[PDB]
Amino acid sequence: GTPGNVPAARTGIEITAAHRAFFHALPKVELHCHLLGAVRHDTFVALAQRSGAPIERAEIDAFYARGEKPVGVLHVLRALDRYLLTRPDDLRRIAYEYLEDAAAHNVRHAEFFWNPTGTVRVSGIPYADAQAAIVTGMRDAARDFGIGARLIPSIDREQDPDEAVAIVDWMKANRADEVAGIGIDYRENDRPPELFWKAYRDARAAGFRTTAHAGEFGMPWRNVETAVDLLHVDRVDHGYTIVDNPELCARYAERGIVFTVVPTNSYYLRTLPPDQWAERHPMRKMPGLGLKIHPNTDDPTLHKVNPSEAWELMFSHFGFTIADLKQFMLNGIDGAWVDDDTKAAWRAAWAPEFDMLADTLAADKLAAA
Ligand SMILES: [Zn+2]
Known part of the structure; x- marks a missing residue:
């Protein structure tokens, strides 16, 4: 099969065991991952059985089925909030298990999204208890697997902008080194980023970094411009439609804005014909427009893609070379919400590590031959 059940590669590159070992060994950061989109199938089962959720073994499997023109998985996240996540400890568990799974793929630093609005308003778990539980999961995973992490409470853009302000209020009342900034997600259509100006102002005034989903679902490149130049985000999530405006691309290339990208993005898998998906995905064009991108799961x-597979897809389907992947690694370091000393150390250490893995890929290929 193919990672994420995406269309089969039409590029002529055959992925070998050597390639898989390379993608696996690559040191990684992850900057775009939703906690509730990283629940293991069997943990989902355990949560459902304990909560008595109105979801049977087979309803759980349409949830985890990843088809050819795949539907978006936002409804699964919604089901987790409403029926499955009923105690703070459930949030601890899923944070710990996500970080364990990321660490297994040599993710050394993961920054992940969690929507507090759903947890507080729908699950009925107080913010303070929810955040403490997630932070415990993070600290346990650092202890057990050596993976570092940051939590990014994220605005549910389908709810009123007052709920977004409420998140920043919660964050200010519960400061922790693990909690680094805010994001915004859920359905972008008709919920433009400027609607949430107040929460972004408040987050920045409180010393938090910010990011935003923008230009997903074919939404206008204007949303990317608004995120960067009104909300003043530190990085951008997705950003695909920016390719429609090469002038803005030039400006943001010069500013070095990092764009987190997702090869398994459901919208493009669903809307592009399978014979054109890899060819016409705007992500493919972003680096050539000078933009710094970084691939993520x-x-x-729910997408059936692990970090090693996300990196593989960039090479197998999207025409990016080994050298391009080294740049993507460096982009992840630049985009991370850590201090300059940490970034410098990662550059100095991971670049030579990458170089050795690239030489070993060549040696492994020769040995297979
Ligand atoms: Zn996302």
């Missing part, structure tokens, strides 16, 4: 267990 988004919803790894």
